[PDB]
Structure formats: C-alpha cells, structure tokens
Design a protein around this ligand. Structure first.
Ligand SMILES: CCCCCCCCCCCCCCCCCC(=O)OC[C@H](COP(=O)([O-])OCC[N+](C)(C)C)OC(=O)CCCCCCCCCCCCCCCCC
Ligand SMILES: CCCCCCCCCCCCCCCCCC(=O)OC[C@H](COP(=O)([O-])OCC[N+](C)(C)C)OC(=O)CCCCCCCCCCCCCCCCC
Ligand SMILES: CCCCCCCCCCCCCCCCCC(=O)OC[C@H](COP(=O)([O-])OCC[N+](C)(C)C)OC(=O)CCCCCCCCCCCCCCCCC
Ligand SMILES: CCCCCCCCCCCCCCCCCC(=O)OC[C@H](COP(=O)([O-])OCC[N+](C)(C)C)OC(=O)CCCCCCCCCCCCCCCCC
Lengths: 380, 382
C-alpha cells in the first residue's frame, strides 16, 4: 500500500516539476545560451528513467500475460521487483533529474557553480547502485551489479538468459554511454572551471561498437560452448554488420573532412552496409526473436501458432513500428558515431534515442513470450 | 485496498506538496512590499482549515479502524459502504489541489482580463458545488449523508439528537472560525475592493456569528433533556456551552467600552477575564473527565486514566492531556480575539496561527471521544 502511494507521489511530483521545467525553459532561458551541452548531458539520465518506466510497463504486461519472467531471468521466486517498485525507482530518479535541471536553469539559487549539478545527479545514481548498506532493493542492486560484471566482461562467462537480455538492452541504451563519453570530454577540455555557467554560450566508433562487441563475443562464446554454428555465428555476423557500418561512417566522415577524393566509394559502402545491417537485424527480430512469420501460422498468418497476448493488432502494430524504428536506430547510431550530419546532429538523435528505448520495450514482450512458449534461446 | 485509489491519493498528495513549495517560494519572491496580503489569508484560511480538517479526519478514521473503535454502529452509518480513510485523503488532496491552484492564480494573475478577486470565489464555489452536486457521482452517498446531517444540525431543536449530529455540531465549534472568515468575505465583497483593480490590497456583528456552533450545542442537550429528563450531564453541558456565550458577549462589550472612553473599562476587563477562566476550566474539565473519561476511578497501572484503554501507549494519553490543557486556552483566546477587536497590534496573526492548532486539538479529541463512546455510553446513546 505504501509502495503504491510512493508511486503516486513520485508520479505527480515529477509531473509538476516537468510543468515548471517547461515554464522555466520558455521563460528563464536567456535566449542564445547554447542549451545543447545541457540537454546532451541530461539525455542519458532521461533515457535511463524512461527505460525504467517502460520496463515497469514490461513487467506489468509480463505478469498479466501469464509468463514466467521470474524463471527465465533465473530470478528468485520471491523478493523480486514488480512493476510498482520499478515505477517507484523511475519516479524518484525523474524527481532528481527534474530538480537538477531546475537548479541548472536557476543560477541565482546559490553561488555554487551549476556544472556540479549533473554529476551530483549521475553520481547519486552510482551511489544509488553502489549501496553496500542493504537498504534499498539490496537484492535487486546486487543482482544488477553481478549482471553488469558478467556482461561488461563476458568472453569468460557462460551466457544465461539474463546476460543475453541485458547485453541486447545495452545496444538500445548505448546513448547513455555515448553521452557519458561526451560529458567526460566536455568536463576535460571544454568548460573553464571558473565561470558559473555550465551552458557555455575515432574513439566514438569503438564506444558505440562496445555493446555490439559484448553481444558479439557473448554469441561467439555460446557457439564455442554449444557447437551449434547457425543460432550463434549468425548473430555474430549481425553485430559484425554494426561494426562495418560504424567503421564506414567514421571513414566517410574523416575522408569528407579531409576532402579525400575516394569518399564517394566509402559513401556507397556505408549505404550498402547500412541496408545489409538493418535488414539483417530486422529479419532476425521478426523470424527468430519474436518468432513471427512462421510457416505453421494458419489462421494467425504473419504471426506464430501459439499467441498469449489477447489482441492480434498489437503484433502487427509492433511489426510496423519495428520495421520503422529499426531503420531509425541504425541511422541514429550511424549519425551519432561521427560528424555525419553537421546540421541536424543532436536533433535527430534526441528525437530517435527516446524511440529506440520504446522499440526495445515493445520487443521485450515478444522476446520474452517467444522464449517462454518455446525455449528459443536454448537457455533451457 | 484498491491500488488505483492509493495511487490517486499519492498523486494528489505529491501535487499538493509541490504546489505548497511553489507557493512558499513565490510569495517570498513574486510579492511586493506595497501589498497587504492579510485580506487574502483571511479569505483562504477557511479553505485551508477545511482541507486540514479533512486530512486529520482521514488520520482519525485510520486510527479508529486500526484501534477497534467501530465508527459504524456508534456513528449511524451503513456497514456496507463506509468511506475509508483513503477516500478522505483523496477528497482532501483534491480540495488542496484546487486551493493551491486558486492561490497560485491569485498570486500570479495568469490571465490579464480576469481580475484577481474571482479565484477565491471560484474555489469556494467549486467546493460548495461539489458538496451540492445534484448528480450521483464523486462519493454521492457520503455527500448526501453529510448534507442531511448538516440540515439536521443547523435545525437541531426540531430533530432527535443522534450521535452523528452531536459529533458534527461538536466539530463545528473548532470550524467556527471558518464562518467568521465567511463574514469577512461578506464585508470584503460589499465594502472593500474596487471590482476592477488587480492587486492584493491598497496600503460588529461577527461577535454574534461566533456563537452558532455554541448555539447549536446549547440547544442540544436541552432537546435531549426534553425527552430524557436527565439533567445530570445535560444541564451542566448546556451551562458549559453558555459559558461561551457569556465570554463572547463580555469580550464584545469590553471592546466596545475600550474603543471609546466610558470610565468603566476595567470592570468589563475583570468580568471578561473571570468568564474566560471559568469557561476554559469548564471545557477542560469536561473534556478530561466527561468526554475522554480520563481521571476515572480504578486507574491501577494506567494512572490518571481508565482501567481499560485502547491505544497501545499511555504516553499518547498523557501527551493528549497536556496538549488539551495547553491548547484549550489558545482556543479561548482565539475566540476572544477574532469575535471582537482586542489587539489591533497583532490581531490576525494569533487567530491564523491558533486555528490550525485548534483543528489539531479536535483531531486529538476525536481519537478519545469515540473510544470513550465505545468503551462506555458516554453521551448516553447506546
Ligand atoms: C558503465 C556505465 C553504466 C552502464 C549501465 C547503466 C545502467 C543499466 C541498468 C538498467 C537495467 C536495470 C534493470 C534490468 C533488470 C530488471 C528486470 C527484472 O525484472 O529484474 C528484476 C531485478 C531485481 O529482481 P528482484 O529484486 O526480484 O531480485 C531477484 C532476487 N535475487 C537477487 C535474490 C535473485 O530488477 C533489477 O535489478 C532492477 C533494480 C535496479 C534498477 C536500476 C536502479 C539504478 C539506476 C541507475 C543505474 C546506473 C546509472 C549510471 C549513469 C551514469 C553514471 C556515471
Ligand atoms: C487520466 C489519464 C489521461 C492519460 C494520461 C497519459 C499520460 C502518458 C501515458 C502514461 C501511461 C501510464 C501507464 C502505466 C502502466 C499502466 C497502469 C498500471 O500498471 O496500473 C496498475 C497499477 C496498480 O497495480 P495493480 O494492483 O492494478 O496490479 C495489477 C494486478 N491486478 C490486475 C491483479 C489488479 O497502477 C498503479 O498505481 C501503478 C502504475 C500507475 C502509473 C504509474 C506511473 C509512474 C510514473 C513515474 C515517473 C516516470 C518517469 C518517466 C516517464 C516517461 C518520460 C516522461
Ligand atoms: C516522513 C513522514 C513525515 C514527513 C511528511 C509529513 C506528512 C504528513 C504528516 C504525517 C501523516 C500521518 C501518517 C500518514 C497518514 C496515516 C495513514 C497511514 O500511515 O496508513 C498507512 C496506509 C496504509 O494503511 P492500511 O489501511 O493498508 O492499514 C495497514 C494495516 N493493514 C494492512 C494490516 C490493514 O498508507 C497509505 O496508503 C497512506 C496514504 C496517505 C499518506 C498521508 C499523506 C496524505 C496527504 C493528503 C493531502 C492532505 C492535505 C492537508 C495537508 C496537511 C494539513 C495542512
Ligand atoms: C457554511 C459552511 C459550513 C461548513 C461546515 C463543515 C463542512 C465539512 C464537513 C466535513 C466533515 C464531514 C465528514 C465526517 C466523516 C466522519 C464519519 C466518517 O468517517 O464517515 C465517513 C462519512 C460517511 O461516508 P459514507 O460513504 O460512509 O456514507 C455513509 C453511507 N450511507 C450514506 C449509505 C449511510 O463521510 C463523509 O461524510 C464525507 C463527506 C464528503 C467530504 C465532504 C468535504 C467537504 C465539502 C465542502 C464543505 C463545504 C465548504 C464550504 C462551503 C461554503 C459556501 C459558501
């Protein structure tokens, strides 16, 4: 009863803080002040909060549909997180995010420099996750930290379902890692450390391939430990396509900045590998992840035989939104990896990144359902 | 325990909290030293006190339900659809959200064409319309029951006195200040203001109006004595309530004889202060001995208490006793100050500070009155 009350409290403190944020942005902002670094820094936090909210909705749908998402994840049958707790955590982090944004927008609050407010938020999140005091969701935080350890260094780690799931979720949430690297550079060699104005009126390729690299080496490991080349080397190639696409984007940008003559051939390679990568991940999503387009569909054409969710319109809406937002994700991870689009730049990424988490939230239902009804991942 | 009701209660509580923080941070920053905000607090105090009373009554319902004091057979309520404390929290949060929105609109004046004197009127109109909403929605049963109870309270001599009307008439004593503010509104919209300006403010009969709760309490226990012929509790109860009449009349006469020179102000001051002492002592001893039932014989381990308590800690009872003794004098001094013109130097500060404290004192008193009506028939009902 108190958890539901806290969910309601946070959902509404966050609402009024959002209204205040909109009013301050349309009123308090001093016209030309180069807001872009601020929104780029806070985009990671906003994406994390949205991902937590969408994952709460995911747990809600999983519980209603009758799936054993506490068994596939190998979670304990008791003392796991329901949708209420995820909503509460999301609301608390959103409250902190809004308070930090309002403090940044309101300089006359104190004489303390504004640029400390972002870290005080993000560091808090780390301090929230690094909580050895066994106070707040200690089992959940311990499980998450163990998963992060077994994911971020996972050549020498047998891959269970949770490892693969978080590794896949990293690709769609990689905007946070990109923004982290950008803010590290911004604090290193952009701001002056003297003026109290945080607005300030090829590594990128590696960092963006990092989630792809983790899932690549995790599927290579799965093949090594299983000997089934088809279900795993295919995914290895799927993320190799991401490697090639990011590499060709970087080469194209470098050669265009240098005025290199042969940059058009690099553009052609980039576009062909973009088509290849997008189609590859899309066909894997539809055919293997969700398990749709099964030849034994019958009356459930374009879907599979066994359907758990009530309405079939959800599946078709998801198919269309997937075939659109997967192209969106590929174009976004190609643009933000380099200086591909100087004009749009952060605008298209800021529009698409929130949608990549939505696409992954939608994909979570069907991946969990496909793995539940028939053990698609071979995790047994 | 419905999840959606608790979510809405938390939502309204959070909105109310953030709006109160914004009000505190705005009245300090977005106000002007040339303004006179007193006719604004003197208007919104009724709504704020009503919202606080609803919140405290939700807490009281929580306490009664978790303590075993079934306020469904000793409150004349149907034991099939009873307003839970969560619903009281929800209503209080909704009214508080409306209160904060109207207050913020008055502070900022978002619309230029709308002058800053309709927002309090809009808030109070919305509250009364919610109370008198003809259609069957938004706790229609509870609102109809409350309307009928208010009807039979304000016409107490013509109705048999049950417990519900007795209790509502008791609660009106500490809500009497609200009516006083209403009277001020009646003057403020008829004597002050220019009906076209948009600002706070440019740089009696209410003495009789701080009697209607006391009047209804005095007429009750006399309508009861008419049918029961039990003078022992009822006549002294009526005398206790008439101490209020004497105190208010003498405060008014002292104010009238002090505002102009008549050479007998000291006599009125002496008689008013002795009436103050006797009324405060009368009410205090009635609450401690008759209403709460404390200081009863066979105390045993529970010294100064009854032989059978309900609440887990006797520390609660002792704090209640001390709180009543140090707030029943504040209640009387607030009655003296508001009903007349005693201290123009401070004036409204004392009333606006003591009124929420008096509502809190009622909140405490409700815990033990129903307890002593369940472990007894205190009030002589059954
Ligand atoms: C290196 C840079 C950062 C990279 C990582 C960024 C954070 C990624 C974390 C997101 C995923 C968390 C939820 C996934 C699993 C939940 C699914 C589920 O149902 O599982 C139930 C689990 C727990 O289930 P449980 O509670 O029933 O436990 C199971 C029982 N045992 C343990 C006994 C088996 O849910 C969780 O683990 C969620 C709780 C944590 C949610 C996030 C809180 C902290 C948020 C801040 C993270 C750090 C931000 C850093 C930003 C930058 C800083 C510089
Ligand atoms: C009047 C509403 C007008 C439309 C508003 C639209 C606003 C935008 C869309 C919001 C959609 C909300 C969907 C929530 C999930 C469905 C509700 C649900 O689970 O109810 C059951 C639960 C109750 O659980 P329950 O007990 O019903 O559990 C189900 C079990 N059975 C079926 C057996 C009863 O409702 C709740 O009280 C919890 C969820 C309510 C919504 C919580 C929102 C929290 C937000 C915190 C901040 C988020 C920050 C990031 C947000 C994104 C960026 C802005
Ligand atoms: C950290 C606390 C102190 C700082 C915050 C101050 C908050 C206000 C002062 C304390 C409130 C008293 C305790 C909470 C209310 C009692 C109910 C409770 O705890 O029961 C547990 C209940 C659940 O109890 P339950 O019915 O499940 O019973 C538990 C026992 N079983 C399950 C076995 C039957 O939790 C809630 O859902 C509480 C929700 C309400 C919380 C209070 C805030 C409401 C605000 C509404 C607006 C008020 C407007 C007026 C403003 C103030 C006056 C000017
Ligand atoms: C001049 C204005 C005078 C105003 C005087 C004060 C008015 C407000 C009174 C509040 C107390 C009422 C609740 C008592 C509840 C105690 C018993 C209990 O717990 O039972 C639950 C009770 C009974 O609810 P129930 O649902 O159990 O109903 C009983 C069931 N039946 C009917 C089948 C028998 O709950 C209520 O009575 C709640 C009523 C709804 C909340 C109303 C809030 C106030 C609305 C505005 C008031 C007017 C504002 C001023 C207008 C001025 C205009 C100029």
């Amino acid at each position: 009863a108190w958890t539901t009350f806290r969910v309601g409290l946070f959902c509404g403190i966050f609402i009024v803080l959002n209204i205040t944020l909109v009013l301050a942005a349309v009123f308090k902002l001093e016209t030309d002040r180069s807001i872009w670094p601020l929104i780029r820094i806070y985009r990671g936090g906003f994406l994390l909060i949205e991902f937590l909210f969408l994952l709460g909705i995911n747990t809600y749908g999983w519980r209603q549909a009758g799936v054993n998402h506490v068994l596939i994840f190998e979670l304990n049958p008791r003392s796991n997180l329901s949708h209420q707790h995820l909503f509460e955590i999301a609301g608390f982090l959103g409250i902190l995010w809004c308070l930090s944004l309002l403090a940044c927008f309101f300089a006359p609050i104190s004489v303390i420099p504004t640029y400390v407010y972002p870290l005080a938020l993000y560091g808090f999140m780390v301090f929230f996750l690094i909580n050895p005091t066994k106070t707040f969701y200690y089992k959940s935080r311990f499980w998450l930290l163990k998963l992060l350890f077994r994911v971020f260094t996972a050549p020498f780690h047998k891959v269970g379902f949770a490892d693969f799931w978080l590794a896949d979720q990293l690709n769609s949430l990689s905007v946070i890692l990109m923004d982290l690297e950008y803010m590290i550079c911004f604090y290193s060699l952009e701001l002056k450390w003297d003026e109290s104005k945080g607005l300030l009126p090829g590594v990128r390729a590696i960092v963006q391939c990092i989630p792809a690299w983790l899932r690549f080496i995790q599927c290579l490991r799965r093949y090594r430990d299983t000997k089934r080349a088809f279900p795993h080397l295919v995914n290895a190639g799927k993320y190799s396509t991401t490697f090639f696409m990011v590499t060709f984007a970087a080469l194209y940008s470098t050669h265009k900045e240098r005025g290199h003559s042969d940059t058009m051939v690099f553009f052609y390679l980039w576009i062909v590998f973009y088509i290849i990568s997008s189609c590859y991940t899309l066909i894997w999503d539809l055919k293997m992840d969700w398990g749709l387009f099964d030849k034994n569909a019958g009356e459930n054409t374009f879907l599979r035989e066994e359907i758990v969710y009530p309405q079939k319109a959800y599946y078709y809406c998801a198919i269309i939104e997937d075939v659109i937002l997967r192209f969106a994700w590929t174009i976004q991870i190609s643009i933000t990896s380099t200086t591909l689009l100087p004009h749009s730049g952060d605008i298209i990424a800021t529009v698409f990144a929130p949608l990549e988490v939505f696409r992954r939230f939608v994909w979570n239902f069907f991946r969990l359902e496909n793995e539940h009804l028939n053990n698609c991942g071979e995790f047994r």
